[PDB]
């Protein structure tokens, strides 16, 4: 898969695999396996996890 787009300025824009919508500054969380980034509501995250806790997205969590 590939969830990073580039705009005409060369900047990288991450797309959330849960909703196929871009990062819009609202809180996201990064998967410590595949490194895709998700919107918190899209993965049921309601507040920042403990700093020490790794987080894995639904796809990887079943792997």
């Amino acid at each position: 898969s590939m969830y990073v787009i580039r705009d005409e300025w060369g900047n990288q824009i991450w797309i959330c695999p849960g909703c196929n919508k871009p990062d819009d500054g609202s809180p996201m969380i990064g998967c410590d396996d595949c490194d895709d980034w998700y919107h918190w509501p899209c993965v049921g995250i309601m507040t920042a996890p403990p700093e020490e806790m790794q987080w894995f997205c639904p796809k990887c969590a079943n792997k």
């Binding site: 819009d24 809180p27 969380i29 410590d32 920042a48 790794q54």
Partner: peptide, 7 residues
Amino acid sequence: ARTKQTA
């Protein structure tokens, strides 16, 4: 975990 919020 790794989190961000930009706006």
